[PDB]
Amino acid sequence: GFLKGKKGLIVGVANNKSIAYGIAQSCFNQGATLAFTYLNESLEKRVRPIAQELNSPYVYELDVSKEEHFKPLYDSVKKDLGSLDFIVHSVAFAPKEALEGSLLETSKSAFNTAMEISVYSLIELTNTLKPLLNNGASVLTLSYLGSTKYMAHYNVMGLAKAALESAVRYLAVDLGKHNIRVNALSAGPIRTLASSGIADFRMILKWNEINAPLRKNVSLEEVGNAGMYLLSSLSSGVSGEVHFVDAGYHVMGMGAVEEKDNKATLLWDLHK
């Protein structure tokens, strides 16, 4: 098992549809000792049973907007685990109003919330836990094509993911001299609990399914296996990377076509 005996902290499980869960589950099947965090008591109800299922008693409170939660999280990990081999940062947030309409409409406070919660928390979490990381440790965050290309209504969250991918590059430099790796997994759209906060996610999901090279949406298992890879020693030469797990969708410069011997037609134009 490629993570046998390796300790990892999973941040961001909301339910068994969370990207964080897929990753945690794939790492479990590879023999990882997991620990989990939860936003508040409403989320502890959901994390702590799932943690149980992945054979884990280590369940800690972390609201990344509460500076005061981080020292306790450090102490908990040192008490119960002593060291970490990987960290999964699977967390983002923006107010509903910002994930719709235009970027021009965005409030300064919505901006600051999207940036603090979705980007700065990787800095504070990695800085907090840096003293406990073992040789070869691997830090993983989650991004989206909306960072470097326009995606409908993704707006301020595209700005956050662009910064997030840039943070991955700088953190990879900062931490690489201590032989620690930092990567982003850029998932394709996948029906999750936070992804329902995106206006007409469903249409983005369809557009992806029709137009991706593999003519499928990605499965939660596919994101988890890719994540597991990046967390595992299999990827010990990979750092600073933005790894697309999106059924190939990133390569498309235009809608997919299909030919009827006559014209070419957009695939999109066949179903309706």
Partner: protein, 78 residues
């Protein structure tokens, strides 16, 4: 409401919110009477549309408040 439809929707709501079927009545409301946060509801909505192959649009999703709403909606669109 069709009784087979209501009972089947009632089982979903029951399991989803870990309440007894008995407490799931058409008048009941997820926030007030059923103890559901913003996540419970969103999770429950997906469970329903996934179950029924239909999709509650987001605009119609907000306007739901009570068990009757989800039932009367689903019956009109299945």
């Amino acid at each position: 409401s069709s009784m087979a439809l209501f009972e089947d929707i009632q089982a979903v709501i029951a399991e989803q919110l870990n309440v007894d079927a008995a407490q799931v009545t058409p008048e009941a409301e997820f926030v007030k009477d059923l103890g559901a946060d913003s996540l419970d509801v969103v999770e429950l909505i997906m469970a329903l549309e996934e179950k029924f192959g239909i999709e509650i649009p987001d605009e119609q999703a907000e306007k739901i408040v009570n068990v009757g709403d989800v039932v009367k909606y689903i019956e009109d669109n299945k």
